[PDB]
Amino acid sequence: AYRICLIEGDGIGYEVIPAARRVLEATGLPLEFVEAEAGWETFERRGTSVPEETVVKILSCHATLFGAATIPTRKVPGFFGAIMALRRRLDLYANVRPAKSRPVPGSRPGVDLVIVRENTEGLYVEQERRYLDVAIADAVISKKASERIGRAALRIAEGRPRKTLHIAHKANVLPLTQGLFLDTVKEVAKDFPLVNVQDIIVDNCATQLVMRPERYDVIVTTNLLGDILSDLAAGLMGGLGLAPSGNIGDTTAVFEPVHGSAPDIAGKGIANPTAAILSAAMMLDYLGEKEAAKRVEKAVDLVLERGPMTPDLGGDATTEAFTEAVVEALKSL
Amino acid sequence: AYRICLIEGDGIGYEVIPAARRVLEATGLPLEFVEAEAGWETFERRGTSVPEETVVKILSCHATLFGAATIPTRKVPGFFGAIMALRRRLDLYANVRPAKSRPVPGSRPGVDLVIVRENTEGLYVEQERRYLDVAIADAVISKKASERIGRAALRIAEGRPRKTLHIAHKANVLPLTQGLFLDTVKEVAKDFPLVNVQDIIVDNCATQLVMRPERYDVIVTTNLLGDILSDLAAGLMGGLGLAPSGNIGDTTAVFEPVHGSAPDIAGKGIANPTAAILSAAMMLDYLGEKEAAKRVEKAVDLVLERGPMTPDLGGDATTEAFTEAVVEALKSL
Amino acid sequence: AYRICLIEGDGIGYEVIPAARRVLEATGLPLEFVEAEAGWETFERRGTSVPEETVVKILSCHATLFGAATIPTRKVPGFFGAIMALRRRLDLYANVRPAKSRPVPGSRPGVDLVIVRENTEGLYVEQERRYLDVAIADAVISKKASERIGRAALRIAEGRPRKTLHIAHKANVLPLTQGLFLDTVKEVAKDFPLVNVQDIIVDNCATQLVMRPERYDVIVTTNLLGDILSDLAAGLMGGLGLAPSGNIGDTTAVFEPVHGSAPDIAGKGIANPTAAILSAAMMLDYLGEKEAAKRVEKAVDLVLERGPMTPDLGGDATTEAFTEAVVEALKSL
Amino acid sequence: AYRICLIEGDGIGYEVIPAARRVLEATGLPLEFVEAEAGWETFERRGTSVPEETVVKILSCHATLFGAATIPTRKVPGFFGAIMALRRRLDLYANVRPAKSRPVPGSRPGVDLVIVRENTEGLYVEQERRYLDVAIADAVISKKASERIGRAALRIAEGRPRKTLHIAHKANVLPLTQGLFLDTVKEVAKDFPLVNVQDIIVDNCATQLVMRPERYDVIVTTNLLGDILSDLAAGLMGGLGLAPSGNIGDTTAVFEPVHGSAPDIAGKGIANPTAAILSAAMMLDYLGEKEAAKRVEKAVDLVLERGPMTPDLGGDATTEAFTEAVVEALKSL
Numbered sequence A, B, C, D: 001a002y003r004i005c006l007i008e009g010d011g012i013g014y015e016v017i018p019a020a021r022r023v024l025e026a027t028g029l030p031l032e033f034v035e036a037e038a039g040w041e042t043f044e045r046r047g048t049s050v051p052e053e054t055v056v057k058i059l060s061c062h063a064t065l066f067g068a069a070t071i072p073t074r075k076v077p078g079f080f081g082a083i084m085a086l087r088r089r090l091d092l093y094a095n096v097r098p099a100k101s102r103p104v105p106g107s108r109p110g111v112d113l114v115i116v117r118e119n120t121e122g123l124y125v126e127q128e129r130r131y132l133d134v135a136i137a138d139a140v141i142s143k144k145a146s147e148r149i150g151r152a153a154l155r156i157a158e159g160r161p162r163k164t165l166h167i168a169h170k171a172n173v174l175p176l177t178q179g180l181f182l183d184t185v186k187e188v189a190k191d192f193p194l195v196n197v198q199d200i201i202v203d204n205c206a207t208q209l210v211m212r213p214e215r216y217d218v219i220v221t222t223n224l225l226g227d228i229l230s231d232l233a234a235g236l237m238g239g240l241g242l243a244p245s246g247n248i249g250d251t252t253a254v255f256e257p258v259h260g261s262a263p264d265i266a267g268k269g270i271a272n273p274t275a276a277i278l279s280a281a282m283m284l285d286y287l288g289e290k291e292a293a294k295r296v297e298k299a300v301d302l303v304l305e306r307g308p309m310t311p312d313l314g315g316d317a318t319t320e321a322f323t324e325a326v327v328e329a330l331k332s333l
Helices: A013-025 A040-046 A052-059 A083-090 A143-158 A177-189 A202-211 A225-236 A274-287 A290-305 A319-332 B013-026 B040-046 B052-059 B082-090 B143-158 B177-191 B202-211 B225-236 B274-286 B290-306 B319-331 C013-026 C040-046 C052-059 C082-090 C143-158 C177-191 C202-211 C225-236 C274-286 C290-306 C319-331 D013-025 D040-046 D052-059 D083-090 D143-158 D177-189 D202-211 D225-236 D274-287 D290-305 D319-332
Strands: A002-009 A031-036 A063-068 A094-100 A112-118 A128-131 A134-142 A164-169 A196-201 A218-221 A244-248 A253-257 B002-009 B031-036 B063-068 B094-100 B112-118 B128-131 B134-142 B164-169 B196-201 B218-221 B244-248 B253-257 C002-009 C031-036 C063-068 C094-100 C112-118 C128-131 C134-142 C164-169 C196-201 C218-221 C244-248 C253-257 D002-009 D031-036 D063-068 D094-100 D112-118 D128-131 D134-142 D164-169 D196-201 D218-221 D244-248 D253-257
Touching: A002 A013, A002 A052, A013 A031, A013 A063, A013 A274, A013 A290, A013 A319, A031 A052, A052 A083, A063 A274, A094 A143, A094 A225, A112 A143, A112 A225, A128 B177, A128 C134, A134 A143, A134 A177, A134 B177, A134 C128, A143 A164, A143 A177, A143 A218, A164 A177, A164 A202, A177 A196, A177 B128, A177 B134, A196 A202, A202 A225, A202 B225, A218 A225, A225 B202, A225 B225, A244 A274, A253 A274, A274 A290, A290 A319, B002 B013, B002 B052, B013 B031, B013 B063, B013 B274, B013 B290, B013 B319, B031 B052, B052 B082, B063 B274, B094 B143, B094 B225, B094 B274, B112 B143, B112 B225, B128 D134, B134 B143, B134 B177, B134 D128, B143 B164, B143 B177, B143 B218, B164 B177, B164 B202, B177 B196, B196 B202, B202 B218, B202 B225, B218 B225, B244 B274, B253 B274, B274 B290, B290 B319, C002 C013, C002 C052, C013 C031, C013 C063, C013 C274, C013 C290, C013 C319, C031 C052, C052 C082, C063 C274, C094 C143, C094 C225, C094 C274, C112 C143, C112 C225, C128 D177, C134 C143, C134 C177, C134 D177, C143 C164, C143 C177, C143 C218, C164 C177, C164 C202, C177 C196, C177 D128, C177 D134, C196 C202, C202 C218, C202 C225, C202 D225, C218 C225, C225 D202, C225 D225, C244 C274, C253 C274, C274 C290, C290 C319, D002 D013, D002 D052, D013 D031, D013 D063, D013 D274, D013 D290, D013 D319, D031 D052, D052 D083, D063 D274, D094 D143, D094 D225, D112 D143, D112 D225, D134 D143, D134 D177, D143 D164, D143 D177, D143 D218, D164 D177, D164 D202, D177 D196, D196 D202, D202 D225, D218 D225, D244 D274, D253 D274, D274 D290, D290 D319
Parallel strands: A002 A031, A002 A063, A063 A253, A112 A218, A164 A196, A164 A218, B002 B031, B002 B063, B063 B253, B112 B218, B164 B196, B164 B218, C002 C031, C002 C063, C063 C253, C112 C218, C164 C196, C164 C218, D002 D031, D002 D063, D063 D253, D112 D218, D164 D196, D164 D218
Antiparallel strands: A094 A112, A094 A244, A128 A134, A134 B134, A244 A253, B094 B112, B094 B244, B128 B134, B244 B253, C094 C112, C094 C244, C128 C134, C134 D134, C244 C253, D094 D112, D094 D244, D128 D134, D244 D253
8 A cells, every 4th residue: 555644734735735635535546644744833833843753754655745834934933944954854856847738728738848956955055155245155066966866857758758858057157067967967868778868058948948848858957947947837837826846855755736835815715726636646656656647637637627717717616626526527537 | 429339240240230230320320330340250360359459449439239259169269268358347247138029920929028137257257166076156146246237227127118127036045145136126226216126036037927928127137047037038039039138337338139140141141130230229229319229129120010021030031121121111210 | 430341251260350350459440340140150050151131241341351161071052152142243353362471481481472363253154064075164354354353453563562563374375365364454554654564474474483483573364373373372381371362342352361261170279360360461451551451460470480389380379379479569560 | 126206396406406316326226317397497498387298207207306396476477387287187185294303403302293284186176266355265175085185194104103193173163174074084093993093173283283292293184284283393393494295196206395496595506405305215215215214314314413504504515515415424324
C-alpha cells in the first residue's frame, strides 16, 4: 500500500487537501493517509512551524501532499522559519512545475511542458549582505548541484513522449556561474543518449514561451530563473491558480499547489481545488501509478470543460461541488 | 541646431541608419549629422572597435544613433574591450526598452509600455568568482544606483499620458538587495506626486504581462529581471525585429535597434528600417522634439498598416521602397 | 562632576574594580559612581548578560569602567547576544590598546605605544559563508569606517608628545580593501598637520615591533591585524596581566583591563589591580583629566617598582596591600 | 644526479644565486645546474616575466633555486603578472619558513621552528571587490586545501626530532572558515599518530613567539597569518635578510630567500648571500641529502661566528669573500 502524508497547512489548504484526498480515494488505489500539520497556525500552537511529529510522518511515507502556508508579509516573527531546517533535512532539490493546456478562458492550446529548477536549501543558503549603502546577494552554482538537477530533469525528459530537454542559461553574460551549470548538465546528458538536448539563452526562451510555447517539452534552469519562466508559462494557462507543483529528492517528495494560503477567501468554501488535485495526480505519477494519474487528470479536464465553475473561473459554485463532480467523472474513466 | 552622431555599425547598419537619417531629414528639423564608425568591421580595419575619433564625436553631439555590432562567433579575438571602456566612460546607466503594439502580424494589440533597468558598468563590474567546484556571481544593489534609475524611470513615466510606474522587484525573497532597490525608488517617487507608483513582485508582473499587458505603462526593475521582462514583452510583439532602444546617461544618449547586424542579408536591400526609425523617434523625443517624434511614429505605423511590406513582414518590398513610403507619409502627418 | 558607570563583571572584577574606584577617589576629583551589573554571573541571576537598567546607566554617564566577563566553556548556552546588541547600539568603534614598559620582570624597557583599530559591529556584521566544502569570510573596508578610525587614531596621536602615527596596512597585496583604508587615513591626516604620519606594510611593522619597538607611538591598522600587533606588543610586556584598554565612540567610552575574569582565583585577594587602575587612568585622560591621569600612572609605576608584589609579579602581597600603596603613593605625586 | 634549476631573477639575485651555486658545488654532490630566467628584467626582453623555456626547465628538474624579483610598486604594467599563470601550473601549495637561531646581533638563542602556510594560487585566486565606497576581500578556506597543507606540515613535523605541530587559527571569531581549517587538519593528524598535535588561537601564538619562541617546532596556519607570524619570528633572528624559504608542491619545489631584489645595492657586491645559501640547504634537505644539508648549515653558522661581516651585519666585507669563506668552512666538515 502507498503511504501518503497529508499536510493542509493554512487557509485554503483546509479545503483543497481534503478535496484532493477524496479524488485520490476515488481512484480505488491501495492508499494509506497519514495526517500531519505545518504552517503559520501550527507555529502559533507548538512554537514551531514544523513539529518533530510532522518530520517523522513525512519520512515514513512514500510521498507527501501539502496545501499552502501563510507567509508573514507584514513582519518576520521569532524564527517562524523553522521550515528552512526541514528543507535541509529533506533536501528535495528538484522543483518541478508542469505547464499544460486546460479547457479554461485565456488558455493557449497545445502546451505540455515541464520546468525544472533546483532548491538549494538541502545544500546551502545563498546569502545576502548589506554593507552601508551597498547590498550584495550571492547567486551560487556548484558542480554537484548542477549534476543532480540536470540528471533529474533528464529523467523527467526520458519518461515523456518527446524526449526533449532545453537547458536555459545565461552563460553569455555569466561565463563562470551559468557556464558551469551549462557544461555540467551537458556532461550528464551523455548518460541519456535517448534524450534530445538543446541549449538556449534564457532570454530567447522567454520570448519563445510567449510566441510558441508548444516547442518545449522539459526545460532545465537555475533558480530565480525557473520561477520567472514558470510565471510567464502560467500566464498562458490562465494564471497561477491552476498550477500544480512538486519538490523532489532522492528518497521522497512533496507535492503542492503553487497558490498561497489565500486567507481572504478561507473558510468560505469556494477556493478551486484543481491545483491540489493536479498536484496529487503528479504524486501518483511519481509513485508509479502513471495510468491512474492520467485518469485523474482527464477527470479534472472533463470538469473544467463540463462544469461547474468556481469564482476564480467565472462562476459561483462551491469547492465541495467541484470535488464530487471530479470524483464522479473519475468513476467514468 | 542639434548635433546627431551617426554610427552605422555592422551588417544591415549601413542600410537602416541611412534610412533613419532620411526620415529625420524629412521632418525639416535643424539637424547636424556627424558620421562616426564602430563595431566588428571597424575593428578589422583599425585594430579597435571604438576609435578615439568616434568617442570624441559621440561626446560632441547631443545624441547618437547607432545601428548594430556583429558579435564574433567564438573567442573575443582579439579583442573589443574598447566597447567596455566606452560603456564605463559614458555611464549611460538607463536602459530604455519600449514595447508598443504595431499593426503587423503576430503583434498583440493594446500594449504600450516601457521597461527601464540600469546598466551598471559606469559604476562597477559585478564580479564572478569560482572556488574549486563552487561558483558565485555577485548581484549588487546600491542606494546611489537605485536612486538614479528610479529617477530616470519616473521622468519617463511623467512625460507620458497614463502617469503610471510599477516597480518590479524580488523583496519577498531578497529583502536586503531588492528591498534596498524597492525602498529607494519609493523615496524618489516622493518627488513625483503626479506619477502613480505601484510596486509588484516581478514574478506576478510576468504573469500579468502575458495575461493583461495593457495595465502597465512604465516598469522599473533591476538588471537581469528587466531583460527577461523585455523578452516576454518582445514575445507579445512577435519578436525583436521592430523594437527600438535607448541607453541614456546624464549628459547624452545612444539610441539603437534591439536587433543585430544580420550580416547574411547585408547589402540585399531587404532589411526592415522600422526599429532604427523608431529609435530615431525615441531620440527626437529625448532631444525635446516630442511632436516631431510622434509624427515619425505615426508615419511608421501607417506604412506598417498599408505597405510596402519587407520580407520580415511577409512581403517582397525593399528597404528603399519602405523608407520612401515613410518619408512621404511623414509630410502629411 | 563626572558620572562614572562602574561595572564589576565576573570573577576578579569584584576585587579589581573597587580597587580602581579607590584610586580614582584618592585623586579628589568630583566623581559620581553609578553601579551597574553585567556578564556571566549576571546572566545566571537575570536571564540576560546586559540588563536594560545597565544600558540606561551606561548612557547616562560620561564613561564606564568595566572589569571582565567569564566566557562559557562550550556552547553559548543560552545565550548572550545581549552583549552583541549593546555593541551595535553603542557603536564604540575605536579599540584602544596601550602598550607601555612597566618596571616589572619580563617587561622590555623603552616601549610606549598605542594600537588603534575599529570595532565593526556598530556598522555591520562581517559575514561568513560556507558553500559545500568552500568557506568564505568577508573582510570589509569602507571609506566611512576608515575615516573615523583614522580620525580617532590621529586625535590619540595629537594628544601625545611624539606626535607620530604609523598606518599599518596590506595595500601591497590587497590594493582594493587595504588601499581604500590607507588612502582614506592619509586624507584625514591632512587635517592633522602637527602629526607626523608614516605608512608601513603591516608585515614589516611586526618585525620592527620586535626589533625596534621604541620608534613607534600610535599605530592605526585594520581589525585582525591590530589584534596580532597588540599580541606581539603584549609579548614584549611579558603578557596581558597589566594591559589596560578602551573602546571609544562619539559620545561615550568603556574602559576595561585586557585580562579575563580569572574565576579560579576570585575571592582570594591576590588579583593584581594594575590593569583596572591603568584603565581608570585612560578614562581620566579621556574625560579631560590628563594631569590626574598621569598622576595615577605614576603611582602605579612607583608601586610596581618598590612593592608590594602580588603573586603574578613574583611576590606574596595581597590585592588590598597593593591598592593601599597606590592610594598612598598618589597623594605625593 | 640531482638536476637543479637556477633562476637569479632581479637585482641582488645575480649575486646571491651564483654564491649559492658555488657552496652547492663545494658539497661534492652529483649536481647538474640548468639555468633559466624570470622576473622584471626578463619581462622587459621577452614580453613575459616567465618564458615557456623557464617553465619547461623547472619541470625537468628535481628542484629550483630562485633569487628575487623586482616588484613594481610605482605602478602595475601591462600584465607583468604572468608569474600568476606559473603559480597555477606549479601548484606549490606549501609555503615553508624556518626561523632558527643564528650567531648574529639581536638573535634569540634556542630557537628552531618552522611555519607552514598555503599558497592558494594553484587552486584559486582569492578575489577583492570594490563597490562604490565599500570594498570586500575574500578569505577562502576549502577542505581540500586544508587537507593537503595540514598533511604537508605533518610530514615536516614527523621528520623533525620533537615531532610537534601547533595549529594556529582564529576559529573563535571565524567559526565557519577558520573552524573548517582547524577541524580538517585535526582529521588528517589522526594519520600521523607519532606527531604531538596542539591547537592555539593565533593571538596566543603571537604572544608566545615573542616571550618563548623555543616552545614551537612546526606551526601550521592559514594565509595573511603565517606571514605575520613569520615576520614576528624573523624579528627574533635579526630581520628578514637572513631568512630562507621554500614553496613546495607534490612534484617539485622552489627555494628562495625571503628578501627582495634590493635594486639599491645591486651590482655593488655586498649583499649577504646567507639567505640564499640557507635556501639551497633547505633544498638539499628536501631532496634527501639531509646530512649534506646539515653540513652546509654549519658551514654558514661558522662564518656568521668566525667572520667576515657584510654591511647588513655591521661590517664592510664583500659578497664574494663571504662565499669563499663559507666554501672553505664546508671543506672542513
